[PDB]
UniProtKB/Swiss-Prot annotation, chains B, C, E, F:
It comes from Streptomyces avidinii. Residues 1-119 form the Avidin-like domain. Its main location: secreted. This is Streptavidin. Biotin binds at residues 29, 40, 78, 94, 104. Keywords: Biotin, Secreted, Signal. The biological function of streptavidin is not known. Forms a strong non-covalent specific complex with biotin (one molecule of biotin per subunit of streptavidin).
Length: 9, 119, 119, 9, 119, 119, 9, 9
């Protein structure tokens, strides 16, 4: 999930 | 209602919502990269007649993580409460479900605090 | 999509949903008493192009617990996955937030399994 | 919450 | 208490617990592969004087997913309620947190129903 | 491990924990009133060999809300991650289950951030 | 839950 | 998480 849109930097 | 407008989480995401007289929420969620491919439809509901004595106004919304650029085969729901005043906030908990993997290990849980000013 | 239609949880509630070509969910949630005062608006989103290889189709929706009969000053969001086939199901987790009480102890969590046939 | 609409019998 | 003994979830996992007079839970959780490398320490607490009128007995426990064979750098907590009778069950919700990834997207949520007989 | 010692949430609660070499957590949780009747046993587990590259150390614990003064017929589990450094924190999500009410609406969810200094 | 020990002020 | 011990088949 680190690459999911919700968490994107 | 005090809900209509733009709200910012503590991670750099934005959403922009209109609260309808009937209880409808409609808008756009924008992830922290802030470009076209970062914009997603949101829809939800809110309590359009909250208790005058109580702490806040209940609401919830969904984003399915597909737009015309990309598809993360997943959906997040935020469930929470708007609190007005000089430091207005929407306090939420969220559930992110993936469509692709088996359901019993498919759902992340977290929280977001939305404010009217950026972090 | 396989989502449009009527679905039943294991507690006697029903919802009735239309899945739009664009990703929209619109419908009515009906609590187990099944009368007029038990009907509430629902809105949400789903993945309108799910992975063909994956387990299911991600979706979510919200009900604010106000209708023209009553107001429970709260909102529930369901986040989950539709799985098709002969025993189609929508597997969900949900968050119920009260608007009236302070936010940090305001949210119940649970789960619902929806089927096309009643329990 | 036992009396909330979501859980009514 | 009715809690001491062996319990099975609906996925093939087992745990074996002793409920102490003081409120302590101690035992072993065994994942569905059922071998040595599938056994993990569990510890928790329960209400050692539940309401006689109420539905069940509150309890919770933790497994950190490290044993002498492997380490998944994570921990799961189950929070729930034991219900006795002819079809005794422990109804739970769980949170699985990974230690390795950033905290805000680190936690899965789910549910398990434990019975005295296997699924 | 960096975990042993006293930690404060942002609401005025405290806990005091010892992290054993084996993965055990043992201690006392003290609610914000801070008196004798506010002290409860806690037990849990943590990853005693976390990834050196990763963000933190996975852990979880349980409090059953009974002591020799009172009984709230319930249990809370916290699942989370310790992060060290100059501003050490334990980031958690929690599940509070009541034993007395029917299981499907029995569980509250929330979050706590614990620090080494008081809020 | 406002009166539960976990949330007491 | 499909390969995590908790969910192993």
């Amino acid at each position: 999930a680190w690459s999911h849109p919700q968490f994107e930097k | 209602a005090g809900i209509t407008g733009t709200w910012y989480n503590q991670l750099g995401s934005t959403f922009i919502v209109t609260a309808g007289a009937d209880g409808a929420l409609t808008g756009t969620y924008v992830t922290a990269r802030g470009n076209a491919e970062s914009r997603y439809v949101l829809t939800g509901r809110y309590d359009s007649a909250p208790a005058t004595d109580g702490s806040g106004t209940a609401l919830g919304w969904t984003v399915a993580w597909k737009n015309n650029y990309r598809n993360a085969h997943s959906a997040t729901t935020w469930s929470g409460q708007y609190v007005g005043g000089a430091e207005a906030r929407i306090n939420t908990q969220w559930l992110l479900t993936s469509g692709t993997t088996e359901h019993w290990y498919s759902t992340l849980v977290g929280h977001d605090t939305f404010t009217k000013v950026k972090p």
